[PDB]
Symmetry: D2
């Protein structure tokens, strides 16, 4: 069981180059199941989830190869089932159902169980496919979908904003007969990126980025080359790294317009931020951050994927900061761990009352999820002494070589064998 | 204390002509404070709040008068205060602060206290004006704002979706120096309508209806003629009137695209719905409605202003319906009253578990707010016997002659004076 | 519409004599319906609710007259109904159902609608009576109960702690055939007081004050004399009065053991508290209070009836105080009003985040409920300037001559007419 | 990674003998640290947590051994620290802090991190010890407590009901100087059992089982023999096993008075229940259960440790059942798993809306916690087909030979080796 041994305090500063967005690469890779011709997806980060996705695609009869890019050849797809033992390691595989049924008239994915940060039901995904004409049946833990011929475009109103469901529906609609309209669609940058990828394959889509997406089905999708956009969460994570350590940092290969909420909040915390066409710089000028108030919500509001990181910022900030999480029912698992490091906070329903302290104390903590693990690692960087973050495998799911990037910023970190 | 005596059951059917939107007319009337030339706002409903708004405007030195239209002449505004005894009757008067400060460099509105359905703080309004350069201070219960010279355009990220705050900021920005960008802006139809009104006066706005509104300030705004859009909540209310009484109805002067969520939910309840360019028809074919699940959220999702009405629908529907309110913390006040009429339901935090029953029994109930009062009146229409809805004054705030429109649909309703 | 005009700031200090408990007198007065012989209830406060109760009792055919005591002669009862017009002004009228059905085999009370602080359903009351053998129906807004012969003792497990329901069931069981056991009964001091009153009339009860109350029915109850215990909420209100004004006070005719939670919290806020057999003294030594964290819950925990008052204390305390209300869904109505006076707070679900300030500014505020009104009046006493609390009629419901008592403590207060 | 392979459907019926209470054995075992003479604790279940507790005790310099009983000789404790690697596997080890500091004037336990069902802070434990005079510092992830001489008795008001904190304080107080009074103490049967155990060692305690526990310290505690009471949760689990499979069962070595709430709810579901001095029988008469409504709360109300099991009951019951969890913020982890087996439900905040179905379908599910694992195993027993419950190690933490006991009731179950 790998772990990270971090020695602090160390001011994090310097430069870092942002990798491709994990949450854009994943939906785009599954969307590739729709491509009949050759496809090359560029700037794909090297993450555990990308490996799992490739393993799943390959089992479906896809030809997959990667490096900076991931080359996909769907053409000859002969299997249409996502095994239980595979989706249990990555629920994002639910995104295979849509393309499979839309292109091959059938598909079955193991119904994902609960996740650490929430139950994360997938009802809207199913509701959407059903509205497009698919017939779904649940048996042996497998959501089995089928349709006689092509799906039919439909006017679908989402009764809850879902990034995942928007992707599933939008993807399946590209090969549908007629026009589909998604009301109250998710506006996340990844949705826009997935949309443009589909359009590159020949799909006809408009409205991506707004709460109404219109898709006009076509007979088939070809192939092509598409470069994934920068990972805004990785970017926000490193900007926070500097903000909490009094450092200064410049993120290269960034996309500023995808972080208005985060940048605004960082400025409220006292950061000196400047942006360029493809870079963001943050300088704390050696100052301790000012406590801020946050409320997660669908894009363009403050993203829930940044909440754990900002919880940390508040826990070492000047004043009382309050964070309210409205997307996932169980995303405060990092709090009890940071408290072990000396933080002071109380959880009341879905909001954490933070009472910032001068300095944290190194201690043995346990990563519970992707963003929490990154938060605990950053905590170790600025804490006084040695911190051991157990279960860092979580971090390998969404951060490409974070160990190296952090070290290059002045961190004293070492990955060490488990047990 | 006026009351409504309703005798049922009576199947509501026929036609109704929708009046101008209450929530478009209000923000537009206050926006008129920016106009230097004469203004004519058409299709303005005759509601108690419109009277109060006119009173307030006149009290600021505006020349106001009305019929179907409301004619405004704010060329010589010579007062900049919205008195307590006035805003205590209509919290929407907070919308005067923005235009006053943007055009005259000053303004003071009584800080509104709590409302029945929620505390409804106005912090985002103030936060927005402050970001535009205004200096605000609260003294003696009055929110006093000032700015030397014009306001300056700014990039403002709304850490909460607010219809009111979006209106305040967007309105004040039209006369600001530079460009303003509102991130995570409210996308309600009224916002779009208010934006187009401002544009008609000469303002430069784009993005209305999306989560990013861009305003480029100008030196001054002129005058003109603008027709308010159809009231989608009145429309939804009457469509529900038919859906719960097994009737059929056609709403004239309607705007279908503003009700996707509502129409989708009505179909789920079993309604046969047809739409035209400016009309909507619903036929229940004498059927009892099927219970539905609702989750209120910012537009284009299911509107909280229709929640009470749908609570009623579920309470007389076949099955167990669940309604989750996410906009206002206390908007279930109608529930205890309907229970007096024989309804069955339990309130768990912010959601009501409904157990539909065949029929309701007439009884004495009390209106607690605008939408609840309309719900109780509809309940009386389909309940068995005589229902008395006390304090219907609430209904006069947002429904233009609902008594007449309902009667024309077959309702047995009478307005009883003094208690 | 009476109002209170308060001039501040003024230290509140001196002495006050606590009146009889409003919430002990009420259930005991209704319990008297069980008495076949004369009954004298001593130390009954002069409150609006006591008048309404006497009005209701008299209209049931009871002979009632009062001063310090309330003399009851329920030997004859010619009416077994509590009218809408009457219960709509006091939901506590529901307590008449139990005794009426237990002694006369029948009874009906108008089903109370919603209340300001919560829906306050009365299901457990009905559930309890039904378990004792009563048959209950809801027709035309009235809950009609009946039983052929006596009620039969039963083992009732309350699946929720309810003061009201415990009183209803315990009272009705005294005339039941057999033994009744109430599991998870409310342990409030008033329950104990009501129990001892019944025992004085000849009833056989044990366990009052614990979560298991055992009642052994008897054929009939006689009469007697019983003195109501001190009102712990009035006591807590005056102790808070001193704590927030840096003053000192001694409450006479108090019962310390009924306020462990409150006294503990006041000490946490920095109060110097001393207690005697029947008195409590609190001295702030001119100190500003320290913010505290509160979580309302059934007795002996912190009482929800003290919550509004402690919200005030936190709002003028040094630090960030957090209050969580778990008894009533909407009991933060005082918050928006105090904010008008300069307080700083945010409401997140069922908890208020308070940010204490040095001084409050006088302003026009509106009482929304009993405890809130008292809170707004105390606010006016310590605020800078003139405060006008509209609708103080609310305060007359549960505070006997609060004006006089506050004045005797140094308050500058006066009641004025004119809505 | 051990798993359970279950073949269904199978009616569970017959008899089972209840083991000693896990949650009474644990606090009593730690309480033994106070004993200067050898102690024999009888009827101790063979659970993983008992092993861990013995490991910890031994590691403190205690002589421990077991079979049906666990023999303890803590006469020579020479070590006072609970290590991270140990408490991370069982947070209940926090109960070592109290006795250690009360008897040896010092003690340090690793601050437990978050748990699956909730953050489970331990603040009240620390607050209590501090009130008794201990000085508590937090360093390196270790809560370190110390006191010069003996602790002093104090009047402690628990501003929240906590089983664990009540045990910690009550245990430490036995060796304190003076009298301690715990206000708003937990009333759980285990508290009563732990109290009587301490009294057996010579401690002076009264009030256990009520809101107020009074402890009068003594110089030292001796030794003795104490038999742990029956495990009410195990009992409830098997009663539910019968109730959901139409079977009949008799639990031997049971203690009925500890399950009033559960038995009442089972009757509401339609069970025919009879009780004896030390046994409980439940017969469903082949009847499918009726949906019920539950709201967890402190004893004697419906226990949260039975919530998962009752969620299952509702999911296969006739009707819509609603369960509201008020003790732990994340105890619905079994829901998503049961949904994989065909169950239908929605989670809204802290309550689950259940829509019972005829029969469940076997599938691969994952145990997430102790009670959830038992629920998934019972689900497998009544589901159609083969169910595989992964991670059943969870079940070994609180159920002694559940495999054997279930088999003896007609279950087709088998523990297949890792993987
Ligand atoms: C793969 C991917 O796109 N993941 C990201 C994606 O995930 P997801 O698609 O599940 O989001 P959704 O918008 O659909 O869910 C939002 C809310 O909607 C509910 N929901 C979702 C679908 C549905 O059918 N029904 C439903 O009720 C959720 O249970 C939740 O309460 O959107 C989230 C919100 O912006 C990110 O927070 C997440 O990232 C994380 C946690 O990734 P993870 O899944 O890998 O763990 C992250 O990296 O931070
Ligand atoms: C005047 C008018 O336009 N009113 C409509 C308008 O009202 P409002 O501007 O207050 O909505 P907001 O979007 O700003 O509020 C939404 C949420 O944001 C909070 N909020 C709002 C402003 C702020 O500074 N801070 C803040 O925390 C609210 O307290 C709430 O929790 O938008 C609501 C949502 O779509 C309608 O539900 C409402 O209609 C009602 C209730 O009208 P009412 O105000 O007249 O009573 C209705 O007719 O149903
Ligand atoms: C008359 C009297 O004894 N009133 C006091 C009494 O009132 P009540 O009996 O209604 O309390 P309950 O214990 O029954 O209510 C507690 C919780 O239980 C719910 N509840 C109650 C009864 C029931 O059948 N079902 C049910 O679901 C409530 O709706 C609430 O969510 O107990 C409350 C809690 O300690 C006091 O807060 C209240 O006092 C106030 C507000 O008086 P009020 O009734 O006059 O307005 C107060 O003076 O502060
Ligand atoms: C070891 C043991 O006695 N465990 C049982 C024991 O556990 P615990 O001591 O933690 O209960 P508490 O009463 O103290 O906690 C109740 C509530 O109080 C909070 N709490 C607790 C202590 C504190 O200092 N502060 C605080 O805020 C909790 O975080 C929770 O929100 O009481 C619970 C309630 O009756 C059982 O539900 C639990 O059983 C479970 C989950 O066992 P577990 O601890 O092994 O996981 C079970 O079902 O077996």
């Amino acid at each position: 069981m790998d772990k990270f041994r971090v020695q602090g305090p160390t001011r994090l500063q310097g430069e870092v180059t942002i990798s491709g967005a994990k949450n854009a690469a994943l939906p785009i890779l599954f969307a590739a199941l729709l491509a009949e011709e050759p496809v090359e997806i560029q700037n794909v980060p090297k993450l555990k989830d990308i490996d799992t996705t490739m393993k799943l695609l390959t089992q479906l009869g896809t030809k997959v190869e990667r490096x900076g890019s991931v080359w996909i050849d769907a053409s000859n797809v002969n299997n249409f089932s996502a095994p239980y033992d595979l989706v249990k390691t990555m629920r994002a595989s639910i995104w295979a159902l849509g393309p499979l049924v839309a292109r091959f008239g059938q598909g079955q994915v193991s119904l994902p169980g609960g996740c650490a940060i929430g139950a994360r039901p997938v009802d809207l995904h199913i509701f959407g496919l059903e509205k497009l004409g698919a017939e779904i049946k649940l048996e042996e833990g497998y959501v089995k979908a089928s349709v006689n011929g092509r799906l039919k475009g439909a006017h679908i109103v989402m009764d809850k904003v879902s990034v995942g469901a928007t992707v599933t529906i939008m993807s399946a609609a590209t090969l549908a007969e007629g026009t589909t309209i998604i009301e109250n669609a998710a506006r996340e940058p990844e949705i826009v990126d997935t949309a443009n990828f589909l359009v590159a394959l020949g799909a006809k889509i408009s409205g991506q980025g707004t709460d109404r997406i219109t898709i006009e089905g076509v007979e088939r999708l070809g192939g092509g080359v598409y470069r994934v956009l920068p990972d805004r969460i990785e970017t926000g994570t490193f900007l926070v790294a500097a903000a909490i350590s009094g450092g200064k940092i410049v993120c290269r290969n960034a996309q500023p317009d995808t972080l208005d909420a985060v940048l605004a909040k960082l400025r409220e915390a006292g950061a000196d931020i400047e942006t360029g066409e493809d870079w963001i710089s943050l300088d704390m000028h050696g100052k301790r951050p000012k406590a801020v108030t946050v409320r997660t919500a669908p894009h363009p509001a403050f993203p829930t994927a940044m909440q754990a990181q900002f919880t940390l910022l508040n826990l070492v900030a000047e004043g009382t900061g309050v964070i309210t999480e409205t997307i996932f029912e169980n995303r405060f698992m990092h709090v009890p761990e940071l408290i072990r490091m000396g933080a002071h906070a109380e959880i009341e329903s879905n909001t954490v009352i933070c009472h910032g302290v001068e300095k944290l104390s190194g201690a043995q903590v346990m990563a519970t999820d992707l963003r929490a693990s990154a938060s605990l690692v950053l905590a170790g960087c600025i804490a006084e002494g040695t911190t051991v973050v157990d279960r860092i495998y979580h971090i390998d799911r969404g951060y490409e070589r974070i160990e190296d990037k952090l070290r290059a910023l002045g961190a004293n970190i070492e990955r060490v064998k488990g047990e």
